[PDB]
Design a protein around this ligand. Structure first.
Ligand SMILES: Nc1nc2c(ncn2[C@@H]2O[C@H](COP(=O)(O)OP(=O)(O)OP(=O)(O)O)[C@@H](O)[C@H]2O)c(=O)[nH]1
Ligand SMILES: Nc1nc2c(ncn2[C@@H]2O[C@H](COP(=O)(O)OP(=O)(O)O)[C@@H](O)[C@H]2O)c(=O)[nH]1
Ligand SMILES: [Mg+2]
Lengths: 184, 242, 192, 427, 430
C-alpha cells in the first residue's frame, strides 16, 4: 500500500500538526504516556513520547500488523528533540535476496553486530532538536550487500519529541526544501 | 405479401385488422413471419439483415414492432422457427448457417453449424423433442443440436429441399419435399430415406403408350422424360439433360 | 509449471523507462525516458530479459522491443552482463509456448551478432539452453507442393531453430559444434 | 496454369475481399470451411488458382489480409468465411494510424514490411504459376493507401515480371468519408502510377447513384456495394478459371487496352443490373447487355465519358452465346458513336466470352473502358488540395512523421503531368 | 482495440462527465457496478471477471465536487485513483490556479493519466473539458495542455469548452480568465468546440417543454452531442468518420481551428407525435439560427466547412437529396474556394434514451459541426469587455500578486487581435 501511488519529491509519514496526526499510526503504552503539546523551543506543536520502559512504549506504522508499507523513496529523514534519556527506533526493509531485514538503532547500545535477522546501530546525538538522516540504500548495501527494496515497517520508541517523519527521493541539503520541511 | 406489408385477420369475426409495413428503412425486403408457441399476441417477422419482434394490443386493435440489436453478422433470412418455449428463436440464412437469437434480450448469441450447409437453409422446424431440423438447396437434410448448433447427423436426397415437416409429439418420422416434385419420408430410428411419390418438375406436354403392353406409359416434359407404371402409380426411369 | 512471477512487472510499475510511445519525431516503435547510454546494464537489461515471458500488454511489447533497442545501441557493455542473462533467459524457454520461443530466438539472433566474444562466452551455457531447442527441432509439417503462410507470423518455430543454430555455429568458434552434438543428435554441421 | 495471390489492405479492402471469397465459394461450391460439396465437375478444373489444399480434404484460399489495428481482423474472424482463411493469413499492427497517410507509410510501414513481405514471398515460390498478385485498397485513408503504395514498390522490386493488378476506390469528390483524403490520394497517386501495371478506379458516389437509378433499393447498405465490387472482380477473373469461346486474361487486357505505359487507369462496369421486382418484365439478350454496359447510368466511375473521348475498351461475356451476335453489336455500337472514338486509335473495343456464368444470372457481362474523362478526377482532388496546401497547417501533421514538405509538390507535379499527358492524347 | 481517454477539469467539466458516462452505460448496457445483467474497449477497460472501468480522470481543486462522485451511485464503477481532488481551490483566479496552486498537483495528475495511456494501445485521441470563466478550468487546463503537447506530440487533443455567454454571466473576472486561456489554447489545442449557456437555455426552453431547467438538462444535451460524435468509432455504419476526419474537415487553417455545433431534432416527448421527423426535416432544422448553441448569427458571416453525422434509419439518397436541397438555400453563403464544404457520416445505431430524461423517442437524428466567420462576433464582445476592465486596471492586483508578470495581459490582447485579424482575411474573397 502506497505501492503505485505517485511518489516523487517528499512523502511524509508523520506530522504533529493536524486534526489526527496519529491516524495511520498505532499506539502501545506501558509505564509512560504519549502526549501532544506546544514546545517553547520552536513555538509550535509537537508529539511527546516518554516512558520509563522505552522497550514497552512505541508507535508503529501501518496500523495493521499484517500489512506493510510501500514507500518508494530511499532516504528517511527524522526530526526529533533529544530528552537526554534512553532512545531507540527500528526500520524493516527488504532486499534483492527477498530476506525481510530489520534495523534497530539505540543510544544505550554498545557495538554494531549485524547478525542475519536484525542489525543494531549505536548512535549519539546533540541535546536538542536533531535531524538524523538515513540513506536506506547506502546502509543496506554497506552492511548486508544486497540492493535496497521498498520499506515495510517503521517503529519509534519512547523518550523523544517527534514532529517530522518523511521520505525524500534523494539527499537534500538545507534550503532546497519547502519552508515547512525544516527546523525553525 | 410481396409489397412488404403484414395484415392480421380475425378468424372468429372473419375480418381483418390494421395493416403495417414490415420494413423500417435500411433493412430490405421481408421474407417470412411466424407465431409464438405460448403467446397469441407475440409473433416474429424476418427479412434480410432484419429480424423484428411484434406484440399485439387488443384495445386499439393494432400491433407494435420491435427491432433486433445491431449485430454485425449481416445475412439474409429465409425461414424461422421458435423453440419449444418462447425464450429462443432460430433463423435460417441464404448462406448456410442458422442464427440463434434470444427473444428476451433481442440479441444473437451463437451461429452454427461450424461446418455450414451448401446454398443456405431452405426449410427449418424445431422438432417436438426439442431439437432443430433443417433443409438445404444442396439436397441434404441435417439435424443440428438445439444447444450450440453442432451437426449430429444428416442424410442426402435429390434436388433442392423446399419443405420439412414433423408430426407434433412424434419422434418416428419426418416428411421432406423436393424441387424435383419428390415426396420422401425419413425414418428417425435407422436414419434412412424412403420415397412415396415422384412427379414432374415443370410443364408436361406429351404422353405415349407402347402398343405391345398398356401397363407402361411414357411422358416428356421440360427438363427430361419419364417412364411410369399404370397398374401401380410409380416411376421407373428418369433421364435429364439440363 | 505455473507462470513464475516476472520481475519486470515489479520494476515497471515504479521505475522503468520505456513507457514513452509518443512521437513528433522520425523514430521507431518505442522511446526511452532517458538515453540508454547513461543507464547501467546490470540492473536494467536482466530485468528486460525476464519481461519477454509476459503474455499481456503493455508489458511484453515494451520488454521485447526494449531488449532489441538496448542490444542494438550498447553492444559493448553487454559482455559484462552476459553471465547474469542465463537465468532469466532459461526461465523464458521453459514456458515452451510457440510464441515466447519466437521472441527468445529473435533476441538470441540479435545477441550473437553483437560480438564473436559473446558467443564464445555462451559455449559453457549451451547445456543450460539447448534442451528446449532439442525438443522442438523437428516440428515441421508436410504439405507436398503447396504453399507456406506461417512465416509472416514468423512462427514456423523449426525454421527459426535452423537459422539461429547456424548463427551460434558460425560465431561459437572451435568447440561450439561438439557441444551442439552433445545436445542435438540430429544436427549436422553447417560450418561450410 | 495461372495462380493469383490476393492481397487486401484497407478496412474497406478487407471487407471487400471477404465478400469476394463469399462469391467465389458460392460459385465454386466451397464450404466456408473449405470442404468441397458442390455439384459441377467444372468447378474443380482450375480451383488451384485461388485455393490451397491442406491434408484432410480442406481448401485454403490465397488471401492476404493487411491492417494496422486488430479491430478489422476481429470483424473478419466474426465473418462467415473467417474460418476459411488460414489463421496465419491475418496480420495487424500495434499502433494505429487514424487515416494519417504519412504515419502508416513511414513509421508503421517500415516495421510492417519485414513481416508482410514473406507471404507475398512464400506464396510466390509456391503459388503454382505467379503471373500476378491482386490488391484492393482505399485511397482516402491512411492505413491502406500508405501501406499499399509502399508494398507495391516492394512487390515491383522483388517481382518485376509478375503483374501488379490493383483495384482502388477513388475519393468521393462531392463528399467522402475522410478528409485527410486529398493529402493521402495525392501522395498515393505518384506511387501508384510508376509501379502498378493496372489500376482500376471506383467511386462510392457512383455506386449509390447506380443503386437508385437501376436497383431501386430504397435503403441500401455497404453489403450491396461490396457485392457489386465482388461481381466486377468475379467477372474480371472468371476467364482464368472457366471455359468459353474467346477469352482474355490480365496480360491480354493490359496488351489490348494500354496504349502507353502511364495511360492504364481503367473504368469498370457490370451488366445486367435490375431492380428486384422489375426483372420479370425485362427480356435479357445481347443487345440488352450492350445497351446496359455502355449506358452512362451503369458506369461505376464518377467520370462521364461524354465529357471526354474513348481510347480503348473491353467487353467480356459469361455463359453460352453466339459470337456473331456479340461481334454484330461490337461493330454497330462502334459505328454508332464515332464522336467518342479516337480517330488514330481504332479497334478500341475488344471482345471475350466465358462459358460458365454465375449462379442464377444466366447471362452476364463485364465492361472495362479507357476514356480521357479521367482528367476530371485528378482536377477535383488537385483543386481541393490547393487551398488546403496553401495554408500548411495540415502538413506539419505529416512533417512530424518525417515526411518532407517538398514531398507533396512532386506528387502534385506528377499529377499535373499525368493530367497534361491525357490532354494532349485527346487531340 | 481503438481507445479514447477523457479528462474532466473544473466544476463544470466533472458534472458534464457524469451526464456523459451515464449516457454511455445506458447506450452500452453496462450497470453502475460495472457488470452486465463489442466496442466497450473504446471507452472501458476489462479487469477480468465481469468488471469494466472507464478511461476517465476527474480533476478539480475543490474536494466537494469530486466527493459527490465518490459518494454517488456510480462510485463503484470508477477507480479511486481516477478521481483527483485538490486541497484548496483557485478562487476564480487564473493566476492562483496556474502558478501557485496548479503547480502543486500538475505532476501528480500527469502520472495517473500517462499510466492509463499505456493500457490504451489503440489510443487515437483525448477528450478535454473546460470552463473558461473558472479559475481551475482555465488556470490548470492551460498548463496541463502545455505539458501534454510536449509529452505526446502528434496525438489528437480534442477540447470541448463553455465559452462565456454574451449577456448571461456568473463571474465578474470572466473576461480576464477567458482571454488568457485562449492565448494558451490557440497554440496547443488540436481542435476545440464552443457552447454558451445562454443559447442552451433558449434551446432547452423553446424546443424542449421545460419551464425552468437546471444544469442537469444542459449536461444531458451536451452528452447527446458527444455520444453522437463518438458513435462513429464504436458502432457499424454506412459511413464512418474518424477523429482526424472530424479535425481536418473543419479547420483548413491552423489558427482558424474553431468550429460550432448544433443538433436536431431536439423535440419534446409529446410534440414529436405530430411530425415525421424525416431526414429532410432534420437537415433543414440544423441551419436554423435558433437551434445552434452559440449565440452568433451565421447569416452575418459565411460558412467555411460543414460536417454531418446521421444516427438512425438514414439513407444514402435522402442525405444526397437533402445536401443538394440545402445547397440551394440562398440564405446560406459559401466562399467559392469552399465549393464542396460538406461531409456526412451514417451510423446505424439509434440514439439512446435516458430514464428521467428530457428527450423524445426519436428514430433518426443528425449532429452537425461547422466552421464560420460568425465566431468573430463573440470575440469582439470579449475584447470590448476586457478593455473596460483593463482601461482602469480594475482587477490587476489579484492576478499580479498571485504570480504572472503584468506584461502577459498585452500579450494576450495582441494574440486576440491577430486571431480576429486572421479570421477576417479568411472571410475575404479574392
Ligand atoms: N453548462 C454548464 N456550465 C457550468 C456548470 N457548472 C459551471 N458551469 C460554468 O462554469 C463557469 C465557471 O467555471 P467553474 O468550473 O464553475 O469554476 P472553477 O473552474 O471550479 O474555478 P474555481 O472554483 O475558482 O477553481 C460558470 O460561468 C458556469 O457558467 C454546469 O454544470 N453546466
Ligand atoms: N465501399 C466501402 N467503403 C468502405 C467500407 N468500409 C469502410 N469504407 C471506407 O474506408 C475509408 C476509411 O478507411 P481507413 O479507416 O482509413 O482504412 P484504410 O482503407 O486502410 O485506409 C472510408 O472512406 C470508408 O468510406 C465498405 O464496406 N464499403
Ligand atoms: Mg473550482
Amino acid at each position: 500500500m502506497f505501492r503505485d501511488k505517485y511518489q516523487a519529491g517528499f512523502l511524509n509519514l508523520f506530522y504533529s500538526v493536524g486534526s489526527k496526526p496519529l491516524s495511520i499510526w498505532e499506539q502501545h503504552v506501558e509505564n509512560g504516556y504519549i502526549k501532544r503539546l506546544t514546545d517553547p523551543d520552536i513555538r509550535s506543536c509537537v508529539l511527546e513520547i516518554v516512558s520509563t520502559t522505552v522497550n514497552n512504549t512505541y508507535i508503529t506504522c501501518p496500523i495493521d500488523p499484517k500489512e506493510e508499507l510501500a514507500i518508494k523513496l530511499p532516504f528517511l529523514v527524522l526530526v526529533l528533540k533529544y530528552l537526554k534519556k534512553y532512545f531507540t527506533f527500528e526500520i524493516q526493509v527488504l532486499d534483492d535476496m527477498n530476506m525481510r531485514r530489520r534495523f534497530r538503532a539505540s543510544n544505550f547500545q554498545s557495538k554494531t553486530r549485524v547478525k542475519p535477522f536484525v542489525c543494531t546501530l549505536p548512535m549519539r546525538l546533540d541535546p536538542g532538536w536533531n535531524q538524523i538522516q538515513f540513506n536506506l540504500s547506502d546502509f543496506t548495501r554497506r552492511a548486508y550487500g544486497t540492493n535496497y527494496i521498498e520499506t515495510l515497517r517503521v517503529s519509534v520508541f519512547a523518550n523523544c519529541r517527534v514532529r517530522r517523519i518523511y521520505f525524500s527521493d534523494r539527499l537534500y541539503t538545507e534550503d532546497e526544501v519547502p519552508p515547512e520541511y525544516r527546523l525553525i | 405479401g410481396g409489397d412488404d406489408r403484414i395484415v392480421i385477420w380475425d378468424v372468429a369475426r372473419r375480418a381483418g385488422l390494421n395493416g403495417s409495413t414490415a420494413t423500417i428503412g435500411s433493412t430490405g425486403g421481408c421474407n417470412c413471419v411466424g407465431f409464438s408457441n405460448n403467446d397469441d399476441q407475440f409473433f416474429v417477422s424476418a427479412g434480410d439483415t432484419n429480424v423484428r419482434f411484434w406484440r399485439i394490443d387488443e384495445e386499439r386493435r393494432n400491433f407494435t414492432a420491435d427491432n433486433m440489436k445491431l449485430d454485425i453478422t449481416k445475412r439474409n433470412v429465409t425461414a424461422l422457427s421458435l423453440d419449444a418455449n418462447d425464450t429462443y428463436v432460430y433463423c435460417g440464412t441464404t448462406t448456410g448457417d442458422v442464427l440463434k437469437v434470444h427473444c428476451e434480450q433481442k440479441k444473437l448469441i451463437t451461429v452454427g453449424p461450424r461446418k455450414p450447409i451448401g446454398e443456405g437453409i431452405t426449410a427449418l422446424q424445431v422438432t417436438p423433442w426439442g431439437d432443430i431440423a433443417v433443409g438445404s438447396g444442396c439436397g441434404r437434410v441435417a439435424i443440428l443440436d438445439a444447444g450450440d448448433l453442432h451437426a449430429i447427423t444428416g442424410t442426402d436426397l435429390q434436388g433442392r429441399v423446399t419443405s420439412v415437416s414433423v408430426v407434433p409429439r412424434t419422434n418416428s418420422e419426418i416428411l421432406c419435399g423436393t424441387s424435383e416434385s419428390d415426396i420422401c419420408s425419413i425414418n428417425t430410428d435407422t436414419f434412412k430415406a424412403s420415397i412415396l411419390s415422384k412427379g414432374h418438375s415443370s410443364a408436361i406436354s406429351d404422353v405415349f403408350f407402347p402398343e405391345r403392353s398398356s401397363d407402361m406409359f411414357l411422358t416428356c416434359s421440360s427438363g427430361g422424360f419419364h417412364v411410369w407404371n399404370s397398374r401401380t402409380y410409380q416411376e421407373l426411369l428418369r433421364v435429364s439433360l439440363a | 509449471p505455473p507462470r513464475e512471477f516476472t520481475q519486470f512487472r515489479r520494476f515497471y510499475d515504479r521505475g522503468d523507462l520505456p513507457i514513452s510511445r509518443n512521437y513528433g519525431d522520425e523514430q521507431g516503435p518505442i522511446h526511452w525516458k532517458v538515453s540508454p547510454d547513461l543507464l547501467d546494464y546490470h540492473h536494467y537489461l536482466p530485468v528486460f530479459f525476464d519481461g519477454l515471458r509476459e503474455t499481456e500488454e503493455p508489458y511484453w511489447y515494451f520488454a521485447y522491443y526494449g531488449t532489441l533497442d538496448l542490444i542494438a545501441q550498447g553492444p559493448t557493455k553487454i559482455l559484462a552482463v552476459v553471465p547474469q542473462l542465463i537465468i532469466p533467459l532459461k526461465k523464458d524457454l521453459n514456458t515452451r509456448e510457440p510464441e515466447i520461443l519466437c521472441r527468445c530466438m529473435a533476441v538470441i539472433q540479435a545477441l550473437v551478432k553483437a560480438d564473436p566474444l559473446i558467443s564464445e562466452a555462451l559455449v559453457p551455457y549451451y547445456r543450460q539452453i539447448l534442451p528446449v531447442f532439442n525438443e522442438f527441432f523437428l516440428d515441421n509439417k508436410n504439405i507436398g507442393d503447396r504453399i507456406e503462410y506461417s512465416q509472416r507470423k514468423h512462427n514456423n518455430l523449426s525454421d527459426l531453430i535452423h537459422e539461429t543454430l547456424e548463427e551460434m555455429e558460425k560465431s561459437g568458434g572451435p568447440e561450439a559444434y561438439i557441444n551442439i552434438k552433445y545436445m542435438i543428435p540430429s544436427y549436422q554441421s553447417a560450418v561450410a | 496454369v495461372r495462380e493469383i495471390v490476393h492481397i487486401q489492405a484497407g478496412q474497406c479492402g478487407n471487407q471487400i475481399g471477404a465478400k469476394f471469397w463469399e462469391v467465389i465459394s458460392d460459385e465454386h461450391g466451397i464450404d466456408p470451411t473449405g470442404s468441397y460439396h458442390g455439384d459441377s465437375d467444372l468447378q474443380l478444373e482450375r480451383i488451384n488458382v485461388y485455393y490451397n489444399e491442406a491434408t484432410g480434404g480442406k481448401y485454403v484460399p490465397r488471401a492476404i489480409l493487411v491492417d494496422l489495428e486488430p479491430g478489422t481482423m476481429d470483424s473478419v474472424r466474426a465473418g462467415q468465411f473467417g474460418q476459411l482463411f488460414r489463421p496465419d493469413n491475418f496480420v495487424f499492427g500495434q499502433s494505429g494510424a487514424g487515416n494519417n497517410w504519412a504515419k502508416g507509410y513511414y513509421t508503421e510501414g517500415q516495421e510492417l514490411c519485414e513481416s508482410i513481405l514473406d507471404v507475398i514471398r512464400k506464396e510466390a515460390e509456391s503459388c503454382d504459376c505467379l503471373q500476378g498478385f491482386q490488391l484492393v485498397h482505399s485511397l482516402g485513408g491512411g492505413t491502406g493507401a500508405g501501406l499499399g503504395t509502399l508494398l507495391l514498390n516492394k512487390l515491383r522490386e522483388e517481382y518485376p515480371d509478375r503483374i501488379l493488378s490493383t483495384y482502388s476506390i477513388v475519393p468521393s469528390p462531392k463528399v467522402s468519408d475522410t478528409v485527410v483524403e486529398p493529402y493521402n490520394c495525392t501522395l498515393s497517386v505518384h506511387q501508384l502510377v510508376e509501379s502498378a501495371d493496372e489500376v482500376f478506379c471506383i467511386d462510392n458516389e457512383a455506386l449509390y447513384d447506380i443503386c437508385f437509378r437501376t436497383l431501386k433499393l430504397t435503403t441500401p447498405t455497404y453489403g450491396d456495394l461490396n457485392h457489386l465490387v465482388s461481381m466486377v472482380m468475379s467477372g474480371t477473373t472468371c476467364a482464368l478459371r472457366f471455359p468459353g469461346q474467346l477469352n482474355s486474361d490480365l496480360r491480354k487486357l493490359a496488351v489490348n487496352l494500354v496504349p502507353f505505359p502511364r495511360l492504364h487507369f481503367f473504368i469498370v462496369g457490370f451488366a445486367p443490373l435490375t431492380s428486384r421486382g422489375s426483372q420479370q418484365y425485362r427480356a435479357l439478350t445481347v443487345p440488352e447487355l450492350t445497351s446496359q454496359l455502355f449506358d452512362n447510368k451503369n458506369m461505376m466511375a464518377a467520370c462521364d465519358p461524354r465529357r471526354g473521348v474513348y481510347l480503348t475498351a473491353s467487353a467480356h461475356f459469361r455463359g453460352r452465346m453466339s459470337s456473331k451476335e456479340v461481334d454484330e453489336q461490337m461493330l454497330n455500337i462502334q459505328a454508332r458513336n464515332t464522336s467518342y472514338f479516337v480517330e488514330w486509335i481504332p479497334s478500341n473495343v475488344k471482345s471475350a466470352i466465358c462459358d460458365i456464368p454465375p449462379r442464377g444470372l444466366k447471362m452476364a457481362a463485364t465492361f472495362i473502358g479507357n476514356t480521357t474523362a479521367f482528367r476530371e478526377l485528378f482536377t477535383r482532388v488537385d483543386s481541393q488540395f490547393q487551398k488546403m496546401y496553401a495554408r500548411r497547417a495540415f502538413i506539419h501533421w505529416y512533417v512530424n512523421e518525417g515526411l518532407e514538405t517538398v514531398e507533396f509538390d512532386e506528387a502534385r507535379s506528377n499529377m499535373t503531368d499525368l493530367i497534361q499527358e491525357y490532354e494532349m492524347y485527346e487531340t | 482495440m481503438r481507445e479514447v481517454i477523457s479528462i474532466h477539469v473544473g466544476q463544470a467539466g466533472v458534472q458534464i462527465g457524469n451526464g456523459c458516462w451515464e449516457l454511455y452505460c445506458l447506450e452500452h448496457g453496462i450497470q453502475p457496478d460495472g457488470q452486465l445483467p463489442d466496442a466497450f474497449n473504446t471507452f472501458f477497460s476489462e479487469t477480468g471477471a465481469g468488471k469494466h472501468v472507464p478511461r476517465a480522470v476527474f480533476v478539480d481543486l475543490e474536494p466537494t465536487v469530486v466527493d459527490e462522485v465518490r459518494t454517488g451511485t456510480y462510485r463503484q464503477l470508477f477507480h479511486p485513483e481516477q478521481l483527483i481532488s485538490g486541497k484548496e481551490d483557485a478562487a476564480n483566479n487564473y493566476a492562483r490556479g496556474h502558478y501557485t496552486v496548479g503547480k502543486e498537483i500538475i505532476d501528480l495528475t500527469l502520472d495517473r493519466i500517462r499510466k492509463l495511456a499505456d493500457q490504451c494501445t489503440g489510443l487515437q485521441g483525448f477528450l478535454i473539458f473546460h470552463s473558461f470563466g473558472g479559475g481551475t478550468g482555465a488556470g490548470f487546463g492551460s498548463l496541463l495542455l502545455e505539458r501534454l503537447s510536449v509529452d505526446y506530440g502528434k496525438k489528437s487533443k480534442l477540447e470541448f469548452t463553455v465559452y462565456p455567454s454574451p449577456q448571461v454571466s456568473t463571474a465578474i473576472v470572466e473576461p480576464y480568465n477567458s482571454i488568457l486561456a485562449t492565448h494558451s489554447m490557440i497554440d496547443h489545442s488540436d481542435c476545440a468546440f464552443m457552447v454558451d449557456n445562454e443559447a442552451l437555455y433558449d434551446l432547452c426552453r423553446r424546443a424542449l417543454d421545460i419551464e425552468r431547467p437546471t444544469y442537469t438538462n444542459l449536461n444531458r444535451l451536451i452528452g447527446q452531442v458527444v455520444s453522437s460524435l463518438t458513435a462513429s468509432l464504436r458502432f457499424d455504419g454506412a459511413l464512418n468518420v474518424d477523429f482526424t476526419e472530424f479535425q481536418t474537415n473543419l479547420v483548413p487553417y491552423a489558427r482558424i481551428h474553431f468550429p460550432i455545433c448544433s443538433y436536431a431534432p431536439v423535440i419534446s416527448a409529446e410534440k414529436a407525435y405530430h411530425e415525421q421527423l424525416s431526414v429532410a426535416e432534420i437537415t433543414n432544422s440544423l441551419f436554423e439560427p435558433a437551434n445552434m448553441m452559440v449565440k452568433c448569427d451565421p447569416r452575418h458571416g459565411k460558412y467555411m466547412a460543414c460536417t454531418l453525422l446521421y444516427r438512425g434509419d438514414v439513407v444514402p439518397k435522402d442525405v444526397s437529396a437533402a445536401v443538394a436541397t440545402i445547397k440551394t438555400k440562398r440564405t446560406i453563403q459559401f466562399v467559392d474556394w469552399c465549393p464542396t464544404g460538406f461531409k456526412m457520416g451514417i451510423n446505424y445505431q439509434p440514439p439512446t434514451v435516458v430514464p428521467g430524461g428530457d428527450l423524445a423517442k426519436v428514430q433518426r437524428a443528425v449532429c452537425m459541426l461547422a466552421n464560420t466567420t460568425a465566431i468573430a462576433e463573440a470575440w469582439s464582445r470579449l475584447d470590448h469587455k476586457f478593455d473596460l476592465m483593463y482601461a482602469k486596471r480594475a482587477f490587476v492586483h489579484w492576478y499580479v500578486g498571485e504570480g504572472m508578470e503584468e506584461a502577459e495581459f498585452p500579450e494576450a490582447r495582441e494574440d486576440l487581435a491577430l486571431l480576429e485579424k486572421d479570421y477576417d482575411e479568411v472571410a475575404a474573397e479574392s
